[PDB]
Amino acid sequence: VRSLNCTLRDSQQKSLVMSGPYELKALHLQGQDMEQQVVFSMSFVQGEESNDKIPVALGLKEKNLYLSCVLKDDKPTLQLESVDPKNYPKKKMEKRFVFNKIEINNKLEFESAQFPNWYISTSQAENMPVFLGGTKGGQDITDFTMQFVS
């Protein structure tokens, strides 16, 4: 499977870090704090390949974690799910682990495949959880930059 390692960063220059075992948060990092940003293993997978929508699966390197979309109060939410490392990564991954990589401008979105109109989002305020945001045009940051690592 075609998969590369990289770091994500929202439009407002907020990096993504681990906050406990099963949560990401987005805060500004400076100097050696920047070392602590999480490296994603974005696996390119099969799915509905529209104009700008490339389907992908975001994993956390050597932690055996993948970002999954699931319901709680009939409301889709972002959660980091444990995975068998000898099985994954895979071509035909389950729709809860699948995000549409939208290049809407020269910015990257990440829409949920299983839950349309629900995008990987961050808050304005520093050091708040990464979640799934139900709007594109709201009070939340749905647009990200990408920095490739190898």
Epitope: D33, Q124, A125, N127, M128
Partner: antibody
Framework: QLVESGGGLVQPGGSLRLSCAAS????????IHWVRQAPGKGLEWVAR????????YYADSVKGRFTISADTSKNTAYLQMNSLRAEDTAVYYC?????????????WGQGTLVTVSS | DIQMTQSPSSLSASVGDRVTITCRAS??????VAWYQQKPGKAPKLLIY???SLYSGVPSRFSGSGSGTDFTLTISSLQPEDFATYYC?????????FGQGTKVEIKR
Amino acid sequence: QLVESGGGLVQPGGSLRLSCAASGFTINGYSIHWVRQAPGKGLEWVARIWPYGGFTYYADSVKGRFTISADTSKNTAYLQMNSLRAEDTAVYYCARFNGYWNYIMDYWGQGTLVTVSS
Amino acid sequence: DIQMTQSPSSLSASVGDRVTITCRASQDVSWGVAWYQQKPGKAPKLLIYSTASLYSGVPSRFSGSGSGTDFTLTISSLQPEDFATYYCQQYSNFPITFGQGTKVEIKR
């Protein structure tokens, strides 16, 4: 309430440690920001620390020279100031910040006057 | 370092009047704008956070609106205790930056 101490008059090149003691909440759940106001000018953002993570971020005018820290056991935040300049003369405020509960520098200390002069 | 150009420098208006303070950004800060009220020789007080959201305990006569780059603080009816300088802030991008403030002085 956030109560500051440590201010006063100091030689150029000198050192001064400012404290920000918190009452009525634990600083562990917040960031503590430091904001200075030069005599008769506006507000300038100095630095902030998340005590929990130990994450620090400095303005370019104080990076290297100033060190922000926190002792969660003393529910207190610090700004250690070194190589002080006439330019660092200001009232220094500390303020709390938490996004998840809409505490957007909602509490500020009384402020403490730091005069840098020979 | 995102510049927060605040207008005007100072203003005056009579008790009960309607005045709006305007704050413009050097680049897009999204919805990460707050408004602070500082009385002479005292610590700033939070009024508006997240462009439009009013902080608990603030009179409803205080409201704010934004458009990514252009943000307005608006006060419908001036009360007595509003002899204050008003600062805009952006906290979406670090370093955090403030406007130079607007002093509002009650007319007689």
